[PDB]
């Protein structure tokens, strides 16, 4: 992948996480569970939806072929009409097929980047209070309960609060 996350340093997806495109899996004394990151997932849904609707809107005109007939002495204008109609048919077929291939590549990259950025968002808060395993997982040097976990997910994680505890356990 272009951003190296999806099918990258995070080798695979989670079938267990069904409520979002991106999210978390946590482990602590209260057990383990999956949780979707609501903000990043919704931002992606709105963007992708906007893209689809935009593509549909730009494709919202139609070229209309006609049933008009031409006599034996109208071979030229008859063939003129055919080449025209086939002409626009080839243009729009090209426009549609190329756009789909291009946008699919870019859509997948978008998701890749979002996973990478979500990872970076967590790495940034945790700092040296956690150990980066390289697979998208962080092992805390301190006890992180459910509210500690939730603070990580919503960006309010308190690094100084757990610093010395992590400091002691790390070294």
């Amino acid at each position: 992948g272009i951003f190296g996350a999806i099918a990258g340093f995070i080798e695979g997806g989670w079938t267990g996480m069904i409520d979002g495109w991106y999210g978390y899996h946590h482990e602590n004394s209260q057990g383990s569970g999956y949780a979707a990151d609501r903000e990043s997932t919704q931002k992606a849904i709105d963007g992708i939806t906007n893209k689809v609707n935009s593509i549909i809107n730009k494709m919202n005109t139609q070229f209309e072929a006609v049933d008009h007939e031409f006599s034996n002495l109208e071979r030229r204008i008859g063939n003129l009409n055919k080449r025209m109609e086939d002409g626009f048919l080839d243009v729009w077929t090209y426009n549609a097929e190329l756009l789909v291939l291009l946008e699919n590549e870019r859509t997948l990259d978008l998701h890749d980047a979002n996973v990478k950025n979500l990872y970076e968002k967590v790495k940034s808060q945790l700092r040296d209070n956690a150990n980066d395993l390289g697979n998208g997982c962080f092992e805390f040097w301190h006890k992180c309960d459910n509210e500690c976990m939730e603070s990580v997910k919503n960006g309010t994680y308190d690094y100084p609060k757990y610093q010395k505890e992590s400091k002691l356990n790390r070294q």
Binding site: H25, E64, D67, L89, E105, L108, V122, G136
Partner: protein, 326 residues
Amino acid sequence: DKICIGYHANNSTTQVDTLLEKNVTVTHSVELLENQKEKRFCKIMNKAPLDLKDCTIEGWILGNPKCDLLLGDQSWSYIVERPNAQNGICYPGVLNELEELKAFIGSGERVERFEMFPKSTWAGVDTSRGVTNACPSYTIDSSFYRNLVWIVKTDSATYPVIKGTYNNTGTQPILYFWGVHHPLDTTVQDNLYGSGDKYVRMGTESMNFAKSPEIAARPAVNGQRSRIDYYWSVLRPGETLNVESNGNLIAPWYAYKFVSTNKKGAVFKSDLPIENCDATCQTITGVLRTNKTFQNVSPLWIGECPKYVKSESLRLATGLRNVPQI
């Protein structure tokens, strides 16, 4: 104690293609192209199509004696013409500017049949005998177009100058037809129309017409080596038509009040059945019920249809690459 960052996976086997990679399985995607059709004709905006059945376009508006089923007023969302339709021009000859006539008729949604020139209009000549076995009715062997009158001389006389006029005082254009007969030999000419140079001349504010009979023996079609040159025109609102001939005139009898359509017009040449049903998109090869943006059924259609392309599939990825574990 751990937290991991990751992404959605599911049991999707649906694939997309990208510029860089083919057959990529993704968690979510949308198909933009419609390849399914209902093989039939339905109503468009609750208006039924016109089935010409065993009659062609020529047979219908000329009033071929076997097309009496269609005869009179018609309203249509579009026109269906059957490929093997047998009832066209029965008495051999060319309907001039046929392709332009078809294009014009297609641009209409309604015709109203009225009598434009009653047989009383032609004073010193016979309107009784204009029949031929080339144009059989269902019940009788020798008939003629319901909208035309084949005019020959009274039993013993010489063909005089006949005149007719129609002032279009209504708000609608009038589609009318007429003809010029071309006997195979001078004998038939003299028999039917008498002797001397003959002419058929017609004119309006915007149109002039003049034709003389061209006598020659052409190959037999429907038992006839003679020919008729059929013509058509449109009398605009406010315009007047003057008819003047001293012979060989197939005269206009009935004509049509013509209502041109606001929308796109269509004439479908197909064997498909017309059923009792509604549709917003009608293709020559069937009905499309879809909200999809693209379609690969046919470029020929009427109503609100998706854009036609040659593609088999146009699937946009919406979700991400599907990598389920284990």
